[PDB]
Amino acid sequence: ANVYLTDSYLKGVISFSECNALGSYIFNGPYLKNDYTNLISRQNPLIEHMNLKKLNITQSLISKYHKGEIKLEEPTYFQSLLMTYKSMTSSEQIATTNLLKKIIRRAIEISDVKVYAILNKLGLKTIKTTLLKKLMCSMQHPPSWLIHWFNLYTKLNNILTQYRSNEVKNHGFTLIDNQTLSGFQFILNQYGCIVYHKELKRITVTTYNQFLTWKDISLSRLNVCLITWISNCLNTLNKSLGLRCGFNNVILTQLFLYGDCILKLFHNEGFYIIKEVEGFIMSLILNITEEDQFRKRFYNSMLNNITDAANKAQKNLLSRVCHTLLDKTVSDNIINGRWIILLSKFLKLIKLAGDNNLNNLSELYFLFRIFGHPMVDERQAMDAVKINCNETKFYLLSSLSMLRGAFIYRIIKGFVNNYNRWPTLRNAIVLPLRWLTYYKLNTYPSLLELTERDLIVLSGLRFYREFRLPKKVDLEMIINDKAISPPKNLIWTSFPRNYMPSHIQNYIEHEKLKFSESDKSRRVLEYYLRDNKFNECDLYNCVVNQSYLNNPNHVVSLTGKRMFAMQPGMFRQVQILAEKMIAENILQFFPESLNNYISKCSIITDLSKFNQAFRYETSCICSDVLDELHGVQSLFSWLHLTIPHVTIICTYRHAPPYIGDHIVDLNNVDEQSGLYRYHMGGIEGWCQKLWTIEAISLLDLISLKGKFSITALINGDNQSIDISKPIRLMEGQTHAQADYLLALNSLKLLYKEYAGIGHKLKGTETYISRDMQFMSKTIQHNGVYYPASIKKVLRVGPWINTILDDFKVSLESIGSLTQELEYRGESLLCSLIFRNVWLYNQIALQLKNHALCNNKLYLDILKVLKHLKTFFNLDNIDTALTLYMNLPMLFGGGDPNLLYRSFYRRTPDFLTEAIVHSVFILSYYTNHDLKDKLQDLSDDRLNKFLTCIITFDKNPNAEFVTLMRDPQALGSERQAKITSEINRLAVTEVLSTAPNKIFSKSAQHYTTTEIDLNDIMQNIEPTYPHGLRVVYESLPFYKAEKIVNLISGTKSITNILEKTSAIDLTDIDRATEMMRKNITLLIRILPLDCNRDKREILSMENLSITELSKYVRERSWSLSNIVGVTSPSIMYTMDIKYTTSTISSGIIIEKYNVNSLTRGERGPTKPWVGSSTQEKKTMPVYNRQVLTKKQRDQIDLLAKLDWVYASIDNKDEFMEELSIGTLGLTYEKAKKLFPQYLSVNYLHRLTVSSRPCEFPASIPAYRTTNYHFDTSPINRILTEKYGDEDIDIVFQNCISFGLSLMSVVEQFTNVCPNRIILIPKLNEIHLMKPPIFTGDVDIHKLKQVIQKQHMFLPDKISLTQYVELFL
Amino acid sequence: NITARLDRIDEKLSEILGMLHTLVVASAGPTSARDGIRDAMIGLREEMIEKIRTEALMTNDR
Amino acid sequence: NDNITARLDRIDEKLSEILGMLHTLVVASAGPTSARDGIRDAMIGLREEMIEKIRTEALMTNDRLEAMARLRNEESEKMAKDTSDEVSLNPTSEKLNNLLEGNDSDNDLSLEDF
Amino acid sequence: NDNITARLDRIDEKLSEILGMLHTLVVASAGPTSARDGIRDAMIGLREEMIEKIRTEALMT
Amino acid sequence: ITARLDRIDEKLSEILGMLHTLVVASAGPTSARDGIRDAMIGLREEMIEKIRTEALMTNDRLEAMARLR
């Protein structure tokens, strides 16, 4: 009564242990490694494995193996063979070639619609566009390499598609085939993948994920080849149309093939060699941007890194396949050291591809995904770190003291700067005198006047509580969709029953009876949903009484997903809280956590293995300060005080430890590979923020000792340290030398100081540069950004990033991903064509092979296309599809990337943009000139469309809550439904039965709460959806909703508490109908009768789209007046001129860069980031630190309501109920905390999650520096018309649009215009003044919402908390 | 000059206090937690004390 | 009356000796016992005492030689190389660089024979 | 004078803190079961003492 | 009595003695350990009194705020 839908893309990892377990069983001997995994899988095999082994085909292959007819290989061997699959028949070559030609042709025919509209709208003027006719001529004959990768992808995709379809239909189904991919016989199961190559007499065994990976590899390589091809074709026509990079696909295929050769010679470990190639590329880049001393140093280090890795790979490979069935698969080229020849060739190819061009070199970063992923040896990874974590460290006390001092120094500096005061000290007496003066005066010395002695002195300080912990748990931070390690005693439940000793199996059954359902959940969400003893203060209480220390249930579980660590909920909650408290209260003090010559250099450090180097003595010396600041002990030191006392175990399903007889207690299990104790902290991902701020404190100590300035930035697991030191330049010394010497002197100090805290750095982890930043994987040279855009779209394909193969979601995903080629790659047309290729495949080719819906969705799109054919009087279905894929998804169309996104990133009004988009798209068919005002043509296709948009049967339903949830929602079934809305009922139906009362109570009242909430602002006339949003956010139902929205995004909602991975049919059917209804939405929106034949088709004469949009929104909700949402489409309202007008009357954008092309160059002007004007408000003076973040946010929300709804005639009762309900304070008291807004008009200032805070141009920031804008001419015209009152057109978008389109023009013309003038359509621009919110608020219903969802309220402000605010 | 000498003395004592306090904090490691003496070494903080006050003021109904 | 001055000098000497020890004091991290059956505390002793424990392998550490050189505030050979003015190539890297320099197709590699 | 006295008074409290920390370190550095249990039990008694003092103050009225 | 500073000398002697006592503790095993833990002052009571003093000082601040309710 359920189905199992498997992944179509790799989402997890390729388990070494799984592959080994399966292969070892099948061939009755060690496969990838001789360890416990291969021993146990043979002794007591899994059913899933037995099923594969017992197949008649498998038995035949096994016999051939044992008879010595065929040889066993590692999957990497096959990866190469698959990727080199050239065994295509003429019919295969023709069929695939014709398919590819068709897809390319269609993608261009599709892009033609937008390109036409854009060129027409700009005025730059089956295919109408001259540009694309030329392109089609070039792309009518795909290269053999593209076909090669396309074919392979297609075949692997077909293999998986057949499997996935059949698995849904028949659980346990195994796909056995040898026809789809000639020469290769596959046996596919979600529990394994056996591949046999007949002609070569070779067999390999891997897992499902490896198969997915092979497909993902062919797809990634396909996308690289495809993008490259498109880019090259575009660049051939016009150097500005394609990507900045330019690759020879011949080199790219050789790189791919050589990389596979490396993986073929170096089995699994060969990935180490590939990994180090990043250094090679970085070196090639540095060889361009750096000075001789800096580039030489890096280069040599880089080569050593690669060769050392290669030698390591050889050592590990040879030692691994020593006693395994793969001992005879080692190439003589490894033994003879010939692999170095293969390597030199591979690297040369990379250098050739780079072609000393930073544009190519940055893009080549795709090479680290293009080869797939290594099999993860979970046990080896465990052992690899064990050695660093059982290690004893030694420190000088002065080292530790100075570091603690530096930490405190920063805390004090932070407090003095942020709260205008020192932290309270419980031992101020430790300070000498100079420091007492600083304390008394609430000041601090700069580092330049600070000494090491002083840091030691500061290290002696102790504090009184300055901050507060939340008393109630924020379920948003705690509830997630991840797995949770079971309690220590139930750790064995993580392994297959057959892999456990009989004593363990019996003990598991006995132990389960001693644990709660929340303990046995194995999942985070379920952990909490099943907790029938849960209360809001459990975490607070546990923290205060340190219930997590010496806790017998504590265990650390590792899985391959870089060795993801899990611990039982109790501990997870503490780990999360400690990080959250740092994030909200502490990081505010660490903003970077987010002579005749001054020498400068930069030290770039990989901190990924830094975590392992931390010890209680080095980290908790600082975390103890945080403990004091929060008045809590052991909260921020929880890790080092707990981890050493627990066993660290690899819990991957197929990687069990060997357990001695009668040993049940994990802590009494013999240490072994993949299992050990006494891990002295350093668990990656835990206490990450703590370690980050500790690193900063160390850097301050370094800058002090080295007598130089540090401007550091830390991001994730790496940091960039910019060092500046004024020196007396020596005779004969140049700047480059001074900088190099600085780097060396500073590097030596840095290494010493890090070593001084137990962290040993390596030349493999740390490197130096002069003045260039390559941090965050963004290459910037001389201020110019050199993107790696291809890397971001490698995985674009049919059912990408979607659940249950949700069609609309995958379209949006393709849209979003391919957008990167335009936003970073700076190629509108390349992104468009590439996008259309995959959207086409997704809708036209793959839609008919849906895993769950078969061809139902396809049949529905056909109905839509037939419908469109009739509605728009089109010639055929192919045309109907061409149109469909260009229509807004908002209207049930297939276009995930509205045209406005090509010019600016954010809009406050999607409806208006969707309408304009459709107008622009339809002009393709109606031949309407977009350079003119809309006028009635003999072709009424557009008027029919617009008529259908505005004319419809009104059907409002729960309009206020819908707007609260989504202020831009339309209602009356005029928009596609989303999973969040469709599944919300299913979620509440499940939650209402949860053991955990907090959730079940909320869920049970969910419907009534929604109703009460709807009928809350229903009496306010000038409805302001963003105002409603604030009201909503200020209420506890908001948090309740977030939990529901979290859950609603999963699969098999109805089986959440059923402890199964199976997908309920109920969910399959609901999702099916959901998708079908959304596909046919376009039919419902555009009826053939125009919603009434007695309704004259809308005339466009003097028609304002802005007004139309407003009307539609109001009609759809049956509201008299909706304000603050409707906004003119800048793309529609601005008429673009490329000349000097008699009167400017518009925005003038000028090119300051002297060159005809600006792409790839930085100019003299400041970068444009949109930047919405902030809120102008007076902040009341009080001790903010007395409040938690959550209650401060609540105060800020109420202040916003006080601001916006100041005009409601029930304001006082409204604010009083809210204040008492959510804070506990009276309005008069709360008002003293509320920011006082000095801004009269909130309509363009109010900050809500529903409104963009920035309106950036659809262009790299560096590229905006080449342009200057002048909005004066237009400001004057607008001032004279609106009398200095606000208007509904966004200022930032007006500018952003101009900047982006100037780039777009360059792309299409190969000439960047000297100036662009944007002349607005004044009839599209309306006065936007703040409304008078007449009408009252339903206080009764307000109270009801607060009460019903009381369990989601934030901490209230107690009298003891309130009084402290004003001391 | 007596005050000047005392100030140098005071600074050295401050430096000593710094070193020793860091030492105390570093010393109160995982093993101090194991034996239940970490709080003794570091000191009690407000929230632990508030819990104590709460218990003290509510041992029964008072 | 120079008796007060003399007393203050004695005070300074004691403070100097106390600081002398503290600035020459080394803290060993808490860690696993030999034959790992528990965790020893973060023993604290003087620089020389900790160095001898490292030298004689009384405490379990990996980079025995570096830990000693570091606590002695001396520059080790490894540190000198890692932070050298010029980075040398490993023999394998020398060969690779020799192959990389000179695109004369000297690789002479046959992939078809793999 | 008063400036000298004030400095001497501050020195005395610093010395007290130094000895306090050293007592903590010297006592903690001794980790037999008896010493450690003695410390833990003393802390239990400490909690109880604070409770009784707090209860007492709460009964002034 | 300016010469009262002799009390500092007295305390510094104890302080240095305690510092020595602390560091020599690591020399116990295999060398200066005839039984388990040799004779030392062992005045945990002083540690406890410092804890009591500090904990109550903190308690006084907490009450000082409760007093405002």
Ligand SMILES: COc1cc(C(=O)NC[C@](O)(c2cc(C(C)(C)O)c(F)c(-c3ccc(F)cc3)n2)C(F)(F)F)cc2cc(C)nnc12
């Ligand atoms: C941040 O979010 C928003 C901003 C704006 C916005 O920026 N409105 C323009 C503004 O009111 C103005 C006044 C004058 C007046 C008439 C007062 O002079 C102007 F002229 C101009 C102006 C125009 C274009 C141009 F090229 C130069 C100037 N802009 C502004 F004040 F907010 F900017 C409108 C929104 C509408 C909605 C529905 N949601 N969010 C909005």
